Design a protein around this nucleic acid. Structure first.
Lengths: 67, 67, 68, 68
DNA sequence: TGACGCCGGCGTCA
DNA sequence: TGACGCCGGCGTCA
């Protein structure tokens, strides 16, 4: 559907829900916040997190990530 | 200073956190929602709540209370 | 009132009922339970609970907290 | 080499890593632990857990979770 | 980072 | 409605 939840996004990136949480928080990434505080990432947001993954897999430190 | 939390609003109204959550959920009182999903009421959002309290104590059914 | 409900004890400790109930179980404070299953705290029990909160905020580990 | 970590098992079951760790503590399920304390589920572990997910949905109580 | 326990909202029994 | 457990976000420790 439109968006997925942290769990779905983490299983697809092969990372942990915790990691997803740290990335969004630390990187100030824009995602929709659910009425209960749950992260809601759209197909477009994933593209962002997908990038964060690739960049990280190149020695790039999370603080030094460009978006 | 300008935003009360459920635990606070409840202690004042002399009720449980669950009671407050139940009045907000059932009667749809638009109250500022926290980025985490926590209710955050205004000094005046407290009145509307202290109102329902007095009404209820007068035999007023929740589904019947008016805002 | 020889007893106070979880919500009274909580409003005095500036915490939710959840937090109070959590502490109770974690340290096993024989605390009474009325015929309805609700918790009935005695002004004596509130004393112990207030203590815990103090020690807790002082870094004292759940497992380390002292009680009578 | 079939040793999955909490994250991989949670993905296969379609639940959070937290939900998994509970099912484990709650039912004393056998899960190996690293020097670091990280879980490492085998082929069986994932099956037992996958079965629990079933019963849980079928309304079966925790304390009553058949355990092949 | 993983494990873990706290926190506040929510559905559910009683 | 209180007690209880689950949820997912978040802080903290190792």
């Amino acid at each position: 559907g439109s968006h997925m939840n942290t769990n779905m996004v983490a299983s697809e990136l092969g990372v942990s829900a915790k990691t997803v949480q740290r990335w969004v928080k630390q990187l100030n990434l824009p995602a929709e916040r659910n009425e209960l505080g749950h992260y809601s990432f759209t197909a477009e947001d994933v593209k962002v997190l997908k990038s964060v993954k690739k960049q990280i897999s190149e020695g790039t430190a999370i603080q030094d990530i460009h978006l």
